[PDB]
Design a protein around this ligand. Sequence first.
Ligand SMILES: O=C(O)c1cncc(-c2cccs2)c1
Ligand SMILES: O=C(O)c1cncc(-c2cccs2)c1
Lengths: 295, 291
Amino acid sequence: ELPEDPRWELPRDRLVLGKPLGEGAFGQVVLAEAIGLDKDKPNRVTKVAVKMLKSDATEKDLSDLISEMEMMKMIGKHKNIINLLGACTQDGPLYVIVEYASKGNLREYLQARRPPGLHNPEEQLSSKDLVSCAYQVARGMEYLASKKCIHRDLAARNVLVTEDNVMKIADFGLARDIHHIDYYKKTTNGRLPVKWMAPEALFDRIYTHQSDVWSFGVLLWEIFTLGGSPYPGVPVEELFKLLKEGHRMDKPSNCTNELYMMMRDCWHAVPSQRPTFKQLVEDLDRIVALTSNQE
Amino acid sequence: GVSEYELPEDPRWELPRDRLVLGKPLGEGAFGQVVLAEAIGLDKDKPNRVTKVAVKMLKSDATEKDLSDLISEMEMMKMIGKHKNIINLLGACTQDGPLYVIVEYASKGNLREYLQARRPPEQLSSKDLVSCAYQVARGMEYLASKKCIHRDLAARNVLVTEDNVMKIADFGLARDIHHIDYYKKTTNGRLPVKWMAPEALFDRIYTHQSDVWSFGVLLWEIFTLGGSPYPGVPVEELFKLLKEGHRMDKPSNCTNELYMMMRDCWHAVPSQRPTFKQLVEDLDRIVALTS
Ligand SMILES: O=C(O)c1cncc(-c2cccs2)c1
Ligand SMILES: O=C(O)c1cncc(-c2cccs2)c1
């Protein structure tokens, strides 16, 4: 039923399906092993993530999956985004093969590395490490912006960490125009997505790279609170009021005033006055070089 | 966990068992034991160069957890790499038989013992003591550059070789930062918590800067020639002293500059403490200007 694309096509028999990994807006995604993903590496297996359709999936659900795959092909590859590795489209269910991130999303990664409870973590992140995650996400966002891709839901839950601690933006090719969004719908973790949305995207339904910069500011706040949850206990109706009044989240402890000013700039009420990702990459780059890893 | 019946191999470290002769025991712990041994052919080009070395292994009563802790130590050492002022990994017998981790041997024991046995009635000069400190700071700067947090830097964990070189030991030791019994004493009868930075002692927050605090107590140990910090102070009283901002007094035969260096390491604010990079630089300058 679907057209063949020899660029990305991998034979179904070269893929060994493993355990689930989804149930988090990412759809039903499973871990797998791909044999000979590369033409020069036929005898080598690579762990990958595989997206597919559920049992009762309408012809529409199929439409969106195909578009996400096309979108990824157009956008191209980058170190800081979940990349497309291949696809199984002939003789069987549709399989979109993408990069696997063994350490999960950034929110979980940060929470699991929080300081000891007075909870007993096995690894801790230095200040340089934190600024470095911020830098990588900005790098991935800058690349996406350069390809005219507007994310629309930038948040730590949508940033993934590979076994080598590389940050990767996911869900950037997700089907759009679904902006008929239910402001009261909670994330699988129990948080309201509206808390990461620029006021113009939230009230005037206008989405731009500038609104993605506003989200990135919230994301920076998440990184420095070690996976803190914005506006805890605040319901949608009250969030609208907080934004109409120009309220801004407070400064996280263990956060330099410069990083907090960066957050405040991303939260400028005027979209054109917010920095760009190009500017954020440069600032963060400089700051990383100057931030101490307690060495 | 496959190490139950067989351990993974690593040819660039493996040493044939016939090339290792176990000897006199050097130390004993809860997890394992260390014995003296002569390795025949450690270094390439010298397949007859018998080297005196120390061998870490498990005791007869060890469990799977102890084995995995010894393996982790060994792996951490490979990852950390070599440096003159740390005890280095030299080899290992991992196949067909008990796991043996071969490291460097320091014939003059730990720093505390070394200083005590040389207290003026070959004794040490002011320059030597500063030299010891410099060496330790250098070893710690290397470790810190490799992301290694010691967590128990003390003179008992610094060994001294035949050539009087200082080597930090137990830096790759897998420790559970929770199961810490503040009342548990060292073989020599002292309380480890006396070396612990306040934030690590109260919030279990271990950083390279918390090691700097320990370094300051080790500095005090060096200039008291193996003196015992807070003699007779039990754990409960120690906590109270720290909350009060109490600081050990300046040792006799110790400059105001070296004492300020200790007090700096004992800053309540970790970010205000110097880093090991700055300690190595200052001690380098101080060593030069020392008689
Ligand atoms: O959930 C994970 O652990 C995981 C890990 N790696 C990749 C992914 C995804 C890629 C693209 C969409 S999901 C998800
Ligand atoms: O006790 C000694 O003299 C001595 C001398 N050299 C090394 C050690 C080590 C023990 C554990 C790791 S290295 C001990």
